[PDB]
Amino acid sequence: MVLAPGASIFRCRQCGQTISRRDWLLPMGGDHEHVVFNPAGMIFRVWCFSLAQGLRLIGAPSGEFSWFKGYDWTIALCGQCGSHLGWHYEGGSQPQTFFGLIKDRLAEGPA
Numbered sequence: 001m002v003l004a005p006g007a008s009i010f011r012c013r014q015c016g017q018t019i020s021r022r023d024w025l026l027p028m029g030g031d032h033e034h035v036v037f038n039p040a041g042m043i044f045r046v047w048c049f050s051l052a053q054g055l056r057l058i059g060a061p062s063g064e065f066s067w068f069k070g071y072d073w074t075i076a077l078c079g080q081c082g083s084h085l086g087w088h089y090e091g092g093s094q095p096q097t098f099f100g101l102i103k104d105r106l107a108e109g110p111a
C-alpha cells in the first residue's frame with residue numbers, strides 16, 4: 001500500500017485503452033515473464049495476467065504452437081484500436097484461463 005502509485009494500470013500503448021493491472025500479474029511456471037518466439041521468428045516478451053479487460057478476442061481457440069502446455073489460444077486485440085496485444089489462453093488447468101500480453105505493447109501508469 002502506497003500513496004499515488006505510478007505503476008498500477010497497464011493501458012494499450014497505441015491508444016490508451018485500459019487493459020490490465022500490475023496486481024493481476026500471474027507467475028505461470030514460476031515467472032510472470034515468458035520469452036517466446038512464433039513460427040515467423042518474432043520474439044515476444046510475454047507477461048502473464050490472470051485477468052484483462054478492453055480486449056477483443058478473435059476467432060476460436062487453437063492449440064497449434066502453444067507456448068503454454070495444455071492451453072489453447074485466441075488472438076487478443078485492443079478492443080479500441082485493434083493493436084495486437086497478445087493472446088488469451090484457455091482449456092488448461094490451474095488456471096483454466098489467463099492472458100499473455102506483449103509487454104512492450106502496453107504502457108504502465110497510475111490508477
Ligand SMILES: O=C1CC[C@H](N2C(=O)c3ccccc3C2=O)C(=O)N1
Pocket residue numbers: 037038039040064065066067068073087
Ligand atoms: O502460444 C502461441 C500464440 C500464437 C503464436 N503464434 C503466432 O504468433 C503466429 C504467427 C504466425 C503464424 C502462427 C502463429 C502462432 O501460432 C504462437 O506461436 N504460440
Ligand SMILES: [Zn+2]
Pocket residue numbers: 012013014015016017078079080081082083
Ligand atoms: Zn489500443
